Design a protein around this ligand. Sequence first.
Ligand SMILES: COc1cccc(N(C)S(=O)(=O)c2ccc3[nH]c(=O)c(=O)[nH]c3c2)c1
Ligand SMILES: COc1cccc(N(C)S(=O)(=O)c2ccc3[nH]c(=O)c(=O)[nH]c3c2)c1
Ligand SMILES: COc1cccc(N(C)S(=O)(=O)c2ccc3[nH]c(=O)c(=O)[nH]c3c2)c1
Ligand SMILES: COc1cccc(N(C)S(=O)(=O)c2ccc3[nH]c(=O)c(=O)[nH]c3c2)c1
Ligand SMILES: [Cl-]
Ligand SMILES: [Cl-]
Ligand SMILES: [Cl-]
Ligand SMILES: [Cl-]
Ligand SMILES: [Cl-]
Ligand SMILES: [Cl-]
Ligand SMILES: [Cl-]
Ligand SMILES: [Cl-]
Ligand SMILES: [Cl-]
Ligand SMILES: [Cl-]
Ligand SMILES: [Cl-]
Ligand SMILES: [Cl-]
Lengths: 396, 396, 396, 396
Amino acid sequence: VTLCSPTEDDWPGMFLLAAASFTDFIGPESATAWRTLVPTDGAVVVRDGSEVVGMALYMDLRLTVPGEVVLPTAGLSFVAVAPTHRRRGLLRAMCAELHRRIADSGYPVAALHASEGGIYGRFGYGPATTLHELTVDRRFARFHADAPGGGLGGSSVRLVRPTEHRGEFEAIYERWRQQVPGGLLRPQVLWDELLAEAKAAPGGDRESFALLHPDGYALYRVDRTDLKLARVSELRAVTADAHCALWRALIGLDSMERISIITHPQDPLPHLLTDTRLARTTWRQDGLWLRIMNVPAALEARGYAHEVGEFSTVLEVSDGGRFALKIGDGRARCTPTDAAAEIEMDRDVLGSLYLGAHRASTLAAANRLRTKDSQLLRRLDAAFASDVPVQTAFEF
Amino acid sequence: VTLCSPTEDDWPGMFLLAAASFTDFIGPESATAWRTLVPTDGAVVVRDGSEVVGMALYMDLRLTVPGEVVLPTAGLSFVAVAPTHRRRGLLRAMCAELHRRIADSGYPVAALHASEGGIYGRFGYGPATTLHELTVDRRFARFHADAPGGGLGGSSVRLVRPTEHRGEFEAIYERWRQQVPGGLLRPQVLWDELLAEAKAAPGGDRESFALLHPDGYALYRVDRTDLKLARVSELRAVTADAHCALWRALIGLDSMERISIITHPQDPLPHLLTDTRLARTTWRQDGLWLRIMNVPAALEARGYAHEVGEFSTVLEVSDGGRFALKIGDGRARCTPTDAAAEIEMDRDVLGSLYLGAHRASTLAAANRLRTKDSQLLRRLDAAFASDVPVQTAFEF
Amino acid sequence: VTLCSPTEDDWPGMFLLAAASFTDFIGPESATAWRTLVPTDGAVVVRDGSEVVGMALYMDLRLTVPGEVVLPTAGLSFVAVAPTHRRRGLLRAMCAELHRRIADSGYPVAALHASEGGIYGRFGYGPATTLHELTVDRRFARFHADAPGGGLGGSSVRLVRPTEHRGEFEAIYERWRQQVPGGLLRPQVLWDELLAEAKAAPGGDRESFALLHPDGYALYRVDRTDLKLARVSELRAVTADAHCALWRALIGLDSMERISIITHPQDPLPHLLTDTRLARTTWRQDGLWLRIMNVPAALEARGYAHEVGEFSTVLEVSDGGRFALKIGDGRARCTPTDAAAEIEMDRDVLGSLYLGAHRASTLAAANRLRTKDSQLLRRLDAAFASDVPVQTAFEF
Amino acid sequence: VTLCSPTEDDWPGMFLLAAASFTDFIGPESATAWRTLVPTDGAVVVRDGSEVVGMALYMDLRLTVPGEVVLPTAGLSFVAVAPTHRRRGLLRAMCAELHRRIADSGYPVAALHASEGGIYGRFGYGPATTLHELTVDRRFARFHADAPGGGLGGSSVRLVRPTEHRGEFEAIYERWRQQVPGGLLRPQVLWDELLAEAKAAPGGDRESFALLHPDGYALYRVDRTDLKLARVSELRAVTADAHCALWRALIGLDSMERISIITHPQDPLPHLLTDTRLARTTWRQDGLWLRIMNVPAALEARGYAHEVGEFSTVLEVSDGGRFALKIGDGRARCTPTDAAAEIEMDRDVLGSLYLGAHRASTLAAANRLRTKDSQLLRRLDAAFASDVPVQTAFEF
Ligand SMILES: COc1cccc(N(C)S(=O)(=O)c2ccc3[nH]c(=O)c(=O)[nH]c3c2)c1
Ligand SMILES: COc1cccc(N(C)S(=O)(=O)c2ccc3[nH]c(=O)c(=O)[nH]c3c2)c1
Ligand SMILES: COc1cccc(N(C)S(=O)(=O)c2ccc3[nH]c(=O)c(=O)[nH]c3c2)c1
Ligand SMILES: COc1cccc(N(C)S(=O)(=O)c2ccc3[nH]c(=O)c(=O)[nH]c3c2)c1
Ligand SMILES: [Cl-]
Ligand SMILES: [Cl-]
Ligand SMILES: [Cl-]
Ligand SMILES: [Cl-]
Ligand SMILES: [Cl-]
Ligand SMILES: [Cl-]
Ligand SMILES: [Cl-]
Ligand SMILES: [Cl-]
Ligand SMILES: [Cl-]
Ligand SMILES: [Cl-]
Ligand SMILES: [Cl-]
Ligand SMILES: [Cl-]
């Protein structure tokens, strides 16, 4: 029972484990395409002895963080342990090896989407974005007098077939992802999957349609069983006008009773309507999880709020070093020190703070970060806050 | 069909309207007690001609706002129009008269809880606090190693009968309400109702119990139909230690599968657990609504964030005046001006900003506040943010 | 095991059987009051040997039939056989004896409400009125421009406490029942029950309210578990204006999502709205059942449609005689004959035709009435039709 | 943004709009076949400027009305406005143009099936047939002694594969449609669709079977998720014997708990059983909607009840002319007049009366038709009633 990088002959066995582990498994053809995102030595397998009983890999990603800074990011995925080999330390062994490789490769951060919420905190990952499902009872929905694009003339939005406007979705998304913390570059094989999923499937999903604006798009489909529910699979808007225009069109889906979308807590949609309550939050969950691999590289790469005045402190990460952290003029400097720590936190907690989705004060109230100075808390809060709201790009 | 302050003889007819309008009507005896909170001329009725077909009143309240400042507050309630007299302008006439009286009396703010979300925005009220229901599957709940109060020895929390510790709940609450934005002074007749509701009722609620800590309490009861659900009706904690201790006790309710609570978006509970996902957000809604009656008095009374540096701007409220607004050193100065507006918003929008629950940027993205300067937005965001998270005290 | 009229000492045992047989049993006090509606020798019991194992009775009622003619009517009720004595012929023996007594007493018709639909047809009862539940989604409900009482000024409807306006409900109902086929005189002990049921009950129904118009009233209550549903227990309108006015008030119940009512198939409510579909038929069932005791007395007492021209036929009822039936000028003459039958039907079928709720053609298509002449069918159809729609007064 | 007849190049864009608007869209191949039912200039499109944002058409149909008279009928269908172009007057503009064309072409009536009930009344369409879903708990179902075809020997009904007996279904249906008000000629491309829908589909409907009698057929299938429910998609019976025989066979579906069918309010099925209650009405909705295009042509073409004696009146349709209406000997004469109106109604109301499904009295009680003479009401009621019950042929 040993651990190594898979050879070509291991992949059929990995796909078997994948099929048995993931109910949404994209299948061997598509998985084989996604292998193009996995660097050489980006994967590990555990063989029994013979067959594969554990696996994990990372993909090369590009993550936007506050200040519109794009970081090379190791995206952990395809993680599975056979049901025959539970409680044998296989996950811990696989994660340790990949983390070794990721750090040595020079990635400042790693990221993943969690199947369950109790697994990845012990390996240094903190939840860093928040998924927020809104369900709109569109039959009652009326736009506020203040809402953009209500006046006379035509609409700027077109109802189109997704496959015929791939180039335009790509361009809009590429713009979106570079300006939003949480944004990920979406490579071509992921655009292949997305448009493949836009098609109707016998006994599966219904056909998807798109609403296209120069500065935004929405992909939606009627739910397979609830025929009065339209599910927006993706809405990417680069301006506020595009966002409002797209929502006017979606609320114009007169066949539907309800429109649902997985969005973020700061989505302005509720405020576009005369009754903000009609945009019901029906589900809330962690999105992207972050493990800061190199504390000073990560903290220095990020932009910080200009509103907070220059301050200096000493931050200890529980097994990640102690640093003199100086933040001013929207930038941080983060250098080694053995001076007494003013702030202490586990590595995962820093991941949760990093994109601005959780407040230091909130984590402090849970005692997940310790400081004896409340002014320092207020300052961290303000400094780490993100000007542009944090969003979740796509699952991987 | 005319409008006036009710005489003693009008109250039976008001209670009839109340019983027919409010399914949770507290009843004539209790309502008669709550009349002690209504000042002379704090109520209006519309009679047909004969009988009462419309009513509304306000109560004298004390609202804590950021900076731990307590404002006299007119709490609109007991608002009803007979089903026989809809679409007759009775609400608009009643609200206009009470607002006249409230302004003339010198209240800087009015507040209410909304039965529906589409009614009160046109009368200048903006939703200002957010209710967040968390449902915990306590069978899986395990506290994080970092969570306060996990070590050896005894517990600081006692399981008690609510009626035998009224004095202690009052003292704890009084402490809580003075330090939390959204806090309301709870007068004695409301403590009477609360403890009356703590009792079992034939065919109604089950008996309530309390968990009591020196610096916090929780009132809870098993749900009447779902006998594996405990509903926490109220949890007031003055320290983080009290909050964690109370949640350790609640999660020790081994008969239950689930614990539910109506709390706020920044409740640190999820971070107390190894699996933050177990604290499921199962419901989200507007709580307290605010109408700023006097813009400069309200804006000057409030504390602002010290982190943001001094700045000056010109704010116009749509039918509420234009002001030179200077914010520095955590205080605002707000004086009349006819200089060009740099920020414009409806009166309700200011109410929504006032306690720090909604961000100016978010409202701007919906075009509910207009400015052509994004630096000004960032500054408003930071300035109006609340250090202590905004909470909802009690419904009225 | 024998059959006789109960003595005073039998009633406790009857109430025991009643309590065990009827989940809506009104209880011993109320049942003792309803005994005032049972004539001397109007009840039978079967004793074992000792205890009561079967019972049945009739009450003296007054039934309005087409032509506004009021008939003395034997209302069968309180019918029960002990679960220990099923399939022993007790029901058949009890019904035969009461029918003997009812016929000998001079009642031309008997009537009942059926617990199950397969029991009473063999004893000569046909379902004669139809219950039609409408559920209105009142949030979308808008009255048609043509609907009565939409203009300026006040409302004619008042929201009142049921107990304070008993006299007015009685007068309105008394008017209603005399002009509607299916109408029943409601005696004082039934008005006692109705107003007793209007009260809230601990762990039971919520408080009832009333909407009162000079020519109509509605009694309604919020549903005990579905707090967004108002159930109209009774709506009696003597004019169309009263009916529309009452429905405007009910649709003005702005707290509710839905209003439900048990009404009749010809209720004009759906046509009062711009979207007739919003008045959803959510349930349909037989109401009053009728056994014609004396065929010629019943048929001659009834009014018939003036539109159909004079015709003559020969009707045979399967064990109820053969008659020369001449119908003209809205009246029938029904005399014995041994001439060949042109129409044949079981006795129950005639009951179903009698108030005009079922068409002869429809029953003919099922072969429940046989004739070889389709012109005769059309004529029966038209003649037996009721000008005023058939309604159900109250359950007994 | 302009309106015109589509060219061949517009159809792909229409199919896109169709796919996005109609969840039951039959698809481009089938839709292309149904184009054969659309006459030259029977369609309109609204283009933006470029793409199609609105569409509507009519098909050439043949509608049976009372008296077994068959009328050329314009069947409105394929009506859609893009969700991007709501509230822009596009529907009103499209309907006005098609109505102009339909009238000028010489159609006396137009018809449609409504997606929602609040849309088409303002354009002159009244609901004219009523869909009535019956659900039979067949495990308790026992046929009445009187029911046809209960005796010894064989059955007249055969269980067959739908595709192998198309000719016989066509012949039976053709007979049915000519004798029933509401009947529509079903052209070959609709028989193509029907038999295509009879096939099982991967992840869709189960296989359909047929029960075939010389004078009737039923098409049924087991429900895809509820495997104890058989849904009768169509039952067409030309005699009562065929109808009863088919229902005996359906109730012989011993694997099923329930049989459901969309039928009409006068279906004799309930009366075929000993317990009429077992035929539960589980759903009720408007079926065919009718717009009378030419009032005198429509009213004169129809047969009327012979039972009512000759009468004359003056009918005004709100923007459709005033007519001297003389009805006698089952025929009407309808000529222009400026004499005072005795009856007034909107055009849609006349559509609702036309096939005999709604009574003039009922509509009068809602004030949807005004007259000051109740004898005239009774006469209209009787005259417009249909001897043969009104049914709904098929959706289009
Ligand atoms: C090289 O192939 C790759 C590489 C990376 C990702 C994927 N997928 C998208 S997957 O196989 O369908 C896939 C992978 C991991 C999952 N993990 C889960 O916890 C879960 O629920 N579903 C999952 C589905 C394929
Ligand atoms: C002087 O008596 C007062 C004064 C102030 C408040 C109250 N109540 C607590 S109440 O009558 O039960 C009450 C009042 C208003 C309501 N409004 C609603 O929209 C609703 O849903 N319930 C409501 C219940 C009694
Ligand atoms: C002399 O006392 C009488 C006389 C006549 C009627 C009544 N009731 C109203 S009852 O007892 O509650 C009652 C009686 C019969 C029922 N039959 C049913 O099939 C059923 O479901 N409920 C029933 C309820 C009391
Ligand atoms: C020329 O092609 C035609 C012509 C006429 C009809 C049809 N169809 C049967 S359809 O496209 O599937 C179709 C059309 C209209 C609809 N309208 C609705 O409100 C709805 O719910 N479904 C609908 C489905 C195709
Ligand atoms: Cl990126
Ligand atoms: Cl930033
Ligand atoms: Cl998002
Ligand atoms: Cl306070
Ligand atoms: Cl503050
Ligand atoms: Cl709270
Ligand atoms: Cl009567
Ligand atoms: Cl009559
Ligand atoms: Cl009724
Ligand atoms: Cl036809
Ligand atoms: Cl006819
Ligand atoms: Cl039908």
